[PDB]
Amino acid sequence: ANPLVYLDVDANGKPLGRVVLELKADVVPKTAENFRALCTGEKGFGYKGSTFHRVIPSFMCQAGDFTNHNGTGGKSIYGSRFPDENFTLKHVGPGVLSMANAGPNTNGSQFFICTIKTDWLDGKHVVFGHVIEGMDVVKKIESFGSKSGRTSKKIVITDCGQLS
Numbered sequence: 001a002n003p004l005v006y007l008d009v010d011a012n013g014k015p016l017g018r019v020v021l022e023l024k025a026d027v028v029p030k031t032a033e034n035f036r037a038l039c040t041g042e043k044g045f046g047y048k049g050s051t052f053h054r055v056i057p058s059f060m061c062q063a064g065d066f067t068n069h070n071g072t073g074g075k076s077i078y079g080s081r082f083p084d085e086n087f088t089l090k091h092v093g094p095g096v097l098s099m100a101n102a103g104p105n106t107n108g109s110q111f112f113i114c115t116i117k118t119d120w121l122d123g124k125h126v127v128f129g130h131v132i133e134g135m136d137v138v139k140k141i142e143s144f145g146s147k148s149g150r151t152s153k154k155i156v157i158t159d160c161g162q163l164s
């Protein structure tokens with residue numbers, strides 16, 4: 001039942017590779033389905049053509065603000081925001097896929113892929129998947145970040161979709 005989706009990512013127009021993510025529809029179906037549909041674009045909008053705007057080495061790579069491209073925007077397939085579904089899944093290490101937010105019950109479209117264990121985010125950010133393949137691509141993304149989050153190159157999700 002768990003979708004496999006993919007992100008194809010470049011830096012300054014140069015492809016970095018493909019990240020494959022499992023979405024834990026068995027634990028957080030509402031959150032998984034939001035991300036799944038934003039990968040396919042089947043609601044008429046989604047991640048394709050948007051950026052990793054905030055990338056912090058030894059922390060995480062954040063993306064999904066396809067409206068403002070700076071961390072202030074994005075929207076879910078349900079509306080602008082939707083509640084925290086649950087906090088069952090934990091930030092157990094590199095490769096965890098989790099919802100960015102602006103506090104309780106503010107999930108939109110922004111998400112992050114961890115590059116370390118970010119356990120202090122447990123109970124505050126909804127984990128909804130993990131990297132199946134392409135953690136080397138995530139590390140390439142991470143290499144273009146900074147401790148401030150600002151990236152040294154424009155990191156673009158050139159394509160995305162569902163594999164199964």
Ligand code: NA
Nearest residue numbers: 056058059147
């Ligand atoms: Na720190």
